[PDB]
Structure 1
Amino acid sequence: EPHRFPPDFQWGVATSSYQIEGAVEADGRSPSIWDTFCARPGAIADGSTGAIANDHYHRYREDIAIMKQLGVNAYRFSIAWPRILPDGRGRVNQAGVDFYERLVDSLLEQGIEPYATLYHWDMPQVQHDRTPWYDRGVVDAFVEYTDVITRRLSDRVKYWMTLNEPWVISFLGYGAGEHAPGLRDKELYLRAAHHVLLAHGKAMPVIRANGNAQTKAGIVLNLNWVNAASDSPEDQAAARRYDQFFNRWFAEPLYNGRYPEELLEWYGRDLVPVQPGDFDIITTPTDFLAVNYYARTTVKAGSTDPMLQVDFVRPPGEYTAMDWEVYPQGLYNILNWLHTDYAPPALYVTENGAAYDDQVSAAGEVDDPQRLAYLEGHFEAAYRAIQAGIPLKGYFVWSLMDNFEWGRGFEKRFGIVFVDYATQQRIIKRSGKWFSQVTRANGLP
């Protein structure tokens, strides 16, 4: 049954720098906000840090060989600002730039297209000391960083992502206190959210300028399918607020030059530090929109989250180890919504995947049928989306291998490749072996 994807479809896997690289003091790297945050009691559920991680800084070539086994034609990673500009600004760290040159050279040598994320949450601590995301001066700082690295890599890297998951950077970082730098303030989150958008917009012309005609760039948004727990007006309203908060807070500014009004009013409109011309910057044209999709979230009115006055409900269904509902149809729905409402020239699924408890068998294999079924359903939903004329150009599985899952530490494994953290051994999981077939087939089954 030829459920084949388009002939140039990009099949990849995704990682982020602090999640896999380790080697946190190597070669002039300065501490990121995450290096500092992991020190805080209760911040990381298993008490771990990203100090070693997958040790990908040293093991990249081996990982690239794994990718060859996987059959991917694309690889999404992030570049660590602390390696490039350890003082946050000013002097370029040659050694740091050199790592990414070696990585990109190795990828292209193996026929793997590099998709580079500029910012995936690891701002140098020294830069955050000067300009936290709630401080407008952060925009120029991120742009300087973008300029340095893009000038060095634009000859080899064609696809760039500006910032990964604005909602996470702003809300979790500054609103819920769950991610670095670990603050919890509604105003700080809204300021951070606005400045992330501004940084994305100011960065785009820089990327295009340091590139060539082939250069493509966009932002990466986390989106999930949102449902109301019931038909009650309070629940419909709760769902609508959460949807505006999670899914529309960035998309509407990016495409329509406005924040969702009802949520804006509810917050207090003056808390967003919009200045004249900001929306013109924010709406700067992009080549694509990248989407990170994981789950359906079902909402009712309540007090669990005091800021939005909502509670979360779990419909009967299948759940991952992250307590996230498995809802493959949600991916189709999100792609369709973006395509009908904003009409981006191209879409990419830059992240999709699942965490389940994995064990290594006596045979030395990792049998993960739940994760495989998860991936299968979502790939199917993406295939349906393409058949419906949605311009989905690629799909990147989160993640290549198990890694530091932020506040959950190393306890939640998202990889299609298992990592034994005692020895750094990599074992391709059953889902990974299956994926090796999908990529070569292009794709299902």
Structure 2
Amino acid sequence: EPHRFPPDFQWGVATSSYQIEGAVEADGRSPSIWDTFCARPGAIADGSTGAIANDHYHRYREDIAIMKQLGVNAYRFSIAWPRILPDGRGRVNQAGVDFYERLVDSLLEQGIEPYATLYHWDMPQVQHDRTPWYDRGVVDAFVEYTDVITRRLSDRVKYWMTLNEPWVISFLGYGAGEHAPGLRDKELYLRAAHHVLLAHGKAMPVIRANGNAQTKAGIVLNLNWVNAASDSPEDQAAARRYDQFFNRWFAEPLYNGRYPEELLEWYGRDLVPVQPGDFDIITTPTDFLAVNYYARTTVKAGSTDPMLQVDFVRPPGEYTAMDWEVYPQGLYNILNWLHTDYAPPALYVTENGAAYDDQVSAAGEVDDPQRLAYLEGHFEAAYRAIQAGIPLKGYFVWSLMDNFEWGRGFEKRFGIVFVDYATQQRIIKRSGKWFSQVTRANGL
């Protein structure tokens, strides 16, 4: 009664360049804003950096053979700007383009469809020094990079995502100081949020011009299910503000050419650097909307976040090692909201997964029953979305393998494949062996 996904459903895994590649000085790559941020005392919980990570730069063929064992028909990765244009603009680093050619050819040779993210947070440092996200000149810098890389690969890459999680780039990078470049200012976050949207909309016709009739592109939004802690008017309004901040701030511009008006007023409307024609650019038609979903966030009126006047509440329930509530209904809820309000022609889940404490048994196995249960419940929510008529075309598990989890460093393991950092040994987890069966059965 709750069995099979559509016959051409895309089952994948996802990664990003800085989280897995390592070889940070190899083959002409220049430092990213993350290579510099990892130097800051207190920025990374375990004091780690992405300098080596999974060494996927060297080990990609072995990682693609693991993908074949998992039976995925798709693979979501990001392209490092610092390998392609190490001076940020101008001179193409041929050897960096060459890595992504070898990666894309190794994937298509194994029948794995490439889903390429253009921007997953690793701007070159030298380019951030000229154009941070809050400087409108960042838009043409991103379009130039997009132009260069899409010209080289669009014969072989059909699916293109512009930027990964505008909320993270803007708010964690410039509003909360938790991600590179590590600034913390309401105005800088709002400028960066606007310029991310404009870089999305200006990139879109360049991806299309450099491609063919098969080329599909879209943006990737992180979205979480937001819940008021109670029916108190103060708590309902706290939830609505947080929802406006987290979920609607990017979606409303993308589909309706407006920011959420109540939150825009709350902030100071003049702080957002909107020019005439900007919403026409931001609303440029997309082929799909990609969604990164992890959790339910429960909000009360409070002062924890002084910017939004909210506190977070943990309902009784199940939490990952990140302290993120496990709420698979939230994924159905988000997909249904997007379907009803915006009618994207296609939806992808480009990230969903969990971090739990993992150990290699005496027998060399990784028994992760809480990660397996996490995935089973979310896959079941996706199946329900499809049965309700929501045009969900694919699902990418975060992550293929344990990697550098940004401010959490390597202590949080998201992989369905375990990495022994002492040896770079990959061990497919119990959750990975289970997924190996889901992909092959195309269902649960």
TM-score, normalisation: structure 1: 1.00
- For 1:327 and 1:14, the matched residues in 2 are separated by 21
- The 5-angstrom pairing of residues 39-438 of structure 1 reads 39-438=39-438
1:124 and 1:23 mapped to 2: Cα distance? 15
Give distance in 1, aligned partners of 2:144 and 2:416.
35
Provide the rounded CA distance (Å) in 1 between the counterparts of 2:77 and 2:175. 26
Query: Per-residue CA shift, 1:242-274, capped at 9, x if unaligned?
Result: 000000000000000000000000000000000
Q: Name structure 2 gaps, 5 residues minimum.
A: none
Q: Deviations over 1:178-206 (max 9, x none)?
A: 00000000000000000000000000000
CA distance, structure 1, for counterparts of residue 260 and residue 2 of structure 2: 42
Spell out, residue by residue over 1:293-351, the C-alpha distance to the aligned partner (whole angstroms, 9 max, x if none): 00000000111111001000000000000000000000000000000000000000000
Contact 2:238 2:310 in 1 (8 A): yes
Distance 1:436 1:31 in 2: 36
Cα deviation, residue 95, structure 1? 0.1
Query: Runs in 1 of length 4+ with deviation above 6 angstroms?
Result: none
CA–CA separation in structure 1 for the residues paired with 2:409 and 2:241 = 30
Report the alpha carbon displacement of residue 28 of structure 1 after superposing the two structures with TM: 0.1
Shift of 1:357: 0.4
Contact 2:118 2:160 in 1 (8 A): yes
In 1, Cα distance between the equivalents of 2:168 and 2:411? 20
For 1:277-306, what per-residue CA distance to the aligned partner results, in whole angstroms no more than 9, with x for missing partners?
000000000000000000000000111111
CA contact (8 A) 2:2 2:383 kept: no
CA contact (8 A) 2:218 2:286 kept: yes
Q: Do 2:143 and 2:199's aligned partners in 1 also have CA atoms closer than 8 Å?
A: yes
* Counterpart-to-counterpart distance in 2, 1:25 and 1:304: 40
Give the match's secondary structure for 2:108: helix
Q: Describe the superposition over 1:122-144 as per-residue Cα deviations: whole angstroms up to 9, x where unpaired.
A: 00000000000000000000000
* SS of 2:363 mapped into structure 1: coil
> Alpha carbon RMSD of aligned pairs, Å?
0.5
> Whole-Å Cα distance in 1 between the matches of residues 110 and 426 of structure 2?
20
Distance (Å, rounded) in 2 between the aligned partners of 1:28 and 1:223: 36
What do the CA deviations read for 1:148-168 (whole angstroms, capped 9, x no partner)? 000000000000000000000
In 2, Cα distance between the equivalents of 1:288 and 1:263?
Answer: 26
CA distance in structure 1 between the aligned counterparts of 2:373 and 2:243, rounded to whole angstroms: 27
1:81 CA drift (Å): 0.1
* Partners of 1:271 and 1:187 in 2: CA distance: 6
Q: CA deviation at 1:58?
A: 0.1
Q: Deviations over 1:86-107 (max 9, x none)?
A: 0000000000000000000000
Kindly state the Cα deviation for residue 443 of structure 1 after the two structures are TM-superposed.
Answer: 1.2
Number of residue pairs matched?
Answer: 444
Query: In structure 1, the residue corresponding to 2:226 is in which secondary structure?
Result: strand
Cα distance between partner residues in 2 of 1:305 and 1:270: 22
Measured after TM superposition, the shift of residue 2 of structure 1 is 6.1
Secondary structure of the corresponding residue to residue 3 of structure 1: coil
CA distance in 2, matches of 1:323, 1:285: 36
What CA distance in whole angstroms lies between the structure 2 residues aligned with 1:25 and 1:443?
42
Contact residue 176 and residue 183 of structure 2 kept, 8 A: yes
Paired-residue identity, %: 100
Residue aligned with 1:199, SS: helix
